Amino acid sequence: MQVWNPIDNPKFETLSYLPPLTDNQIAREIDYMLRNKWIPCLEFDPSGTITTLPGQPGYYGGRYWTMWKLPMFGCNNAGYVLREIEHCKNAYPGCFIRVLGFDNIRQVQCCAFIVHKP
Amino acid sequence: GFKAGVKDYRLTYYTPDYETKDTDILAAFRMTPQPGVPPEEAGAAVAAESSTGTWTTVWTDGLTSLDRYKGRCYDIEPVAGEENQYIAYVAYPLDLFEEGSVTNMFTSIVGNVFGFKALRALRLEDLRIPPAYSKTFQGPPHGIQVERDKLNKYGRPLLGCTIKPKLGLSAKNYGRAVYECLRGGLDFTKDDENVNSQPFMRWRDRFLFVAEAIFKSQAETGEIKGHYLNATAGTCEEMMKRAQFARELGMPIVMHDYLTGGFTANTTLAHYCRDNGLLLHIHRAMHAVIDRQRNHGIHFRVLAKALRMSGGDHIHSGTVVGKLEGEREVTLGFVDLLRDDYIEKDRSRGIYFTQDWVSMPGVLPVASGGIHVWHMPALTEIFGDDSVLQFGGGTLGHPWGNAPGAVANRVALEACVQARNEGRDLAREGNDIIREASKWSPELAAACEVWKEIKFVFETIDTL
Amino acid sequence: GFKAGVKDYRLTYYTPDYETKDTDILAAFRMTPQPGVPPEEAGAAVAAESSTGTWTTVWTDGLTSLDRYKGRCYDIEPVAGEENQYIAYVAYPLDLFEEGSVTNMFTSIVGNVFGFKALRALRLEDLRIPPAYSKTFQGPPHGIQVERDKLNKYGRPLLGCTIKPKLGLSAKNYGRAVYECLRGGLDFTKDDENVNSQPFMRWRDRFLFVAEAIFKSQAETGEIKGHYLNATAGTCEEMMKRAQFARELGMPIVMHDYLTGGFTANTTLAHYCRDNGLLLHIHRAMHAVIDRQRNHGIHFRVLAKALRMSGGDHIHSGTVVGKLEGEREVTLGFVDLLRDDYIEKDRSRGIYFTQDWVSMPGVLPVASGGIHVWHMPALTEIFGDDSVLQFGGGTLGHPWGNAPGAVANRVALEACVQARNEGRDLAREGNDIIREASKWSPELAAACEVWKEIKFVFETIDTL
Amino acid sequence: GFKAGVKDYRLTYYTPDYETKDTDILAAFRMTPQPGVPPEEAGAAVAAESSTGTWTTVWTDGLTSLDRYKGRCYDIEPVAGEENQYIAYVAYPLDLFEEGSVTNMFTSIVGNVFGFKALRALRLEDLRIPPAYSKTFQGPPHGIQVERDKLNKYGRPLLGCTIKPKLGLSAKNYGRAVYECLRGGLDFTKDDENVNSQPFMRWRDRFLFVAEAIFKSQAETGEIKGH
Amino acid sequence: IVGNVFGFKALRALRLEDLRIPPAYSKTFQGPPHGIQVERDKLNKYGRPLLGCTIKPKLGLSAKNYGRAVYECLRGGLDFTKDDENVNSQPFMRWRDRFLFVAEAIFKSQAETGEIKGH
Ligand SMILES: O=C(O)[C@@](O)(COP(=O)(O)O)[C@H](O)[C@H](O)COP(=O)(O)O
Ligand SMILES: O=C(O)[C@@](O)(COP(=O)(O)O)[C@H](O)[C@H](O)COP(=O)(O)O
Ligand SMILES: [Mg+2]
Ligand SMILES: [Mg+2]
Ligand SMILES: [Mg+2]
């Protein structure tokens, strides 16, 4: 028998229960979004906590982050998304960073994962 | 003039050359006449006694127009592989139904014709709802897209678990097995269908002990969590009281059994849940008394399209491999009717008509019943994302506890998602993926060894 | 200790030597196992998954007492005249049900076991309700004896008629065919099951035009009259609004369809009707989708005992001779369960248990569905007094009108009552009585000549 | 991609070859363009600023589908007997309106386009309402046939009269000129449009004095009366 | 004043220009709820005109995308934001879902610049 640790063990949603992500396995999740005609984007925030309200169902605080420049409309090669992450990392070396995708026909996001931690 | 007596049914209600309108409801029946009865008199006797008709002539028929208020049979075909079996088509005018009622439609179409002395069997397969009739319903309270945004969860299917034993636990022990499950990796938790309010555990102090575990497990992992609370009751005044106490505590979701509770009580809860911001989960109980046999009853593909009109955000839909009966092609056919906006005719899956929904939101399907970690690659290829997966005894039956038994259910799903979105075959492989994954996780190699040789294989009864 | 794995069902839930208590609920099932499954594993798999049980072992079983909260099978017998068919008996503890709910009992007993992969059929026949469980229900609002005193009618069965055509009449023509029927000799009048509120006739101005004919026909003959108003609707807020406008006008009786409306909505109308002094009439619609076939479903003798506990003053029960299917012995067996206070075991009529009702009021049965004046002597010997008889097309299809066609239905009943309470045989005779009576009444000789050669004779499907 | 600037209206909203659906609302306009403006730019400038459109390009247009939420002009004809006058046809998708509101339809179709600097006149003539949109309204409370049956009057037109002078009568004199009219052969009587509640006659004691004349004139001729 | 006289057969045109309301008739009305001076004091803004912006495209956006184009506008220097005149409650965006997603952006943009905001 083994015991799961309850102290100082945060998690960050999808893909966060697997071993850490290498640089190769990152440019395989972008070629899957490009093969279905979706639109990449970037975000960053200094904190990651969640707050509530006394008696209002379905209201949570801390779900919006800040957008880097603009969505990349009409992008075909995966070498530009990788270069923009490096520009984002030098300006704010003390924030989290996330990668998103957009489906414009059903109006809903399709992916999300973390690429940098403070 | 007026002439009293008895007449045949095929002199008014059998019209073989008729062109239908785009404002009509259509139905398809499979029937078996008794010996000595023509296949057309029996067909005309089904349209007559559902709209306007009786066994004799009356004088009040001449005070109104009957060709304007009558139903009529227009097509009959024989089944291949049966001496005496046929399929009949019937059309209904629009001005016969009340706007906003699911009760009236079922009272009219199926209320008296199943028990005639001149028949041996009858089954209803499909219906068509014109866009001019579905615009008078509210529909699902939120939908699929408005529910994925409140919870902030994108890119993978959702996960859950139900609490066991079914009955016999107290109120403080019931909420201690919720915290350990939710803190290990799951998203939801649930009551059983028959846990309402009973001498060993009353309803009001369970709602309070469950709400204390969600807050403690939410501040420890940094993710949003929830639990379905059951609002089924014996009267409406009691069902409305248990829905107002979940709103004061700030809970997101509730439950209801819509076939033993009724269709009138399910359209009031749906209206309440829209005006106050709650989510609704629907459980199909007592559905196999009607749906199981091939030659008598109502198919579930018909009971599915009434829920989408009445209102709901989730629904159970069964599994292909498990302890309960189901078929692959029929399931793949009626999931499409639940999730999509335009569906075409495909007789290889059991669809008789073309259906449009003119922008009504879709519903999420739920798969449950006797499934463990070896079925993971097979349940991801059939349903994909946009679905919910539930393990009740495959979580609480782990040899180490409730929390270790929820890490093995999340690692096995993420390991399959990563392999799928890389270009691998989830049908030929699937054993190798789990076998490779159970090498850096010691909680998966333990669950992989107790349920290694468990399968359910029997014959099927329906067979399309 | 705790040992994880999979076990057989017959190691805990099969107890062949058990003596039942007088505080237990009992059930009888007829089943058909799949090839390669012992008849005792299948019986134990039905008791396990209805109270407490699942497909694997869990660690929380040891936090409570299981022999105290479990169901168990104790008797199995084989059917004579079949290879693969058996009868199983199951007992349930009292602390498993919620007091005052018909919904909970059906959710527990029949919610998941009908669709197992290791079965081909299953049917429920009977139940036993101990006196310690039926004392928590209200029951019928008034009863049989409190209803015969408000109306001042003693010594003969009651009479009625329904209005045809089913759909397509306006609101002023609908109330003109009521006055002519009620002024000729009838006691009641009725709507059809699918007349709720529709573009050709809305509900609020029909309630007003019908109330004007009752007052005019009651002051002309000096007898009390009535009409069943239909209160079925799409939500509860609208069903509760049509019941207050009937009380505001001073009407005695209303209607409801309790199988397409639901069990939760039928227990609040019953509570309202007791608190405000109204009478309730119940229509069994959509009942032959479940009850018709011999090897799958639920018998109507079970659905009657739930209505008696939920609440109602009338109920439909079918006829022996007509256009709908029924059997003499089964009907004579389940009428006794509706009208009496103590009933014993009789396997020649289909009763498996002994039932006691400890002073709950009875319910009146109603016969309808395609009967004319030649069936009168046969319907008086079977039911006697304490029943209702309805002729819809046998009244409105008379060659002279609505009022002449209601004198012939009253003369024929009184002529049979007088002959019965004189010592004559109503089975050998009955033709001579009608033939003698149609000599001082010219309205009976006219109806006796249009329906002389009309009978319904086909084969029966159930056959006890 | 995204390119900022100003563009013509006839590059997206003028589709001369389009076949309409049976689930669409249709409108007909008569217009008069200002000098130096083609008759096709002006037509496309009316469909654009009623559903989706503005005077410049924005970046949020690419987050959704625009051919699915846009209105479009499909037919233009000239009026006979006028140098500068035309008729334009515009179609609207169904998912743009709220069910059960007459306010929303008029706010969308006619709310801003009548006061553009590049026009001199504009008039709306007709509309078409599909059956899938009128089924969400209640409609008339009773109708024509349910009202002739409550009053028991068949075979001839109805008759009425309104009371004069318009303003300046007291509450007791107002109700004695009703009895004399109703007892002579009329069926109805009426107030004027600007009699609500005023210092010379308040509303609550006029409702009572009028109800006393109907009862007296109804028991004298044996016919139903009203006001 | 204007209910029947515009459509007489003995006229071809008619237009109304002005009116005069005596002080003995306007004293029976309530008037503006707050005014100009009671509104500049609740917001603490003196010495310059106010600024705003409306959201485009007019119709066709969802409820989560509608509220993330409000935060970016309000955090850059504006004071107000606005709906379009024909955005009430429609199949692509219902009214109760939008009132909640808009209220989440105001709180996040008000705690970052230290000024009062609205919509
Ligand atoms: O009672 C049960 O069996 C379950 O709680 C599953 O428990 P386990 O995971 O322990 O088996 C589900 O409610 C049924 O599967 C519903 O069936 P369906 O969805 O097919 O209608
Ligand atoms: O719809 C009908 O047929 C009836 O109105 C009878 O009309 P008629 O007298 O004109 O035939 C009755 O509701 C059914 O008989 C009910 O059946 P049951 O009581 O057997 O359930
Ligand atoms: Mg369950
Ligand atoms: Mg009927
Ligand atoms: Mg006037």
Ligand SMILES: [Mg+2]
């Ligand atoms: Mg505007």
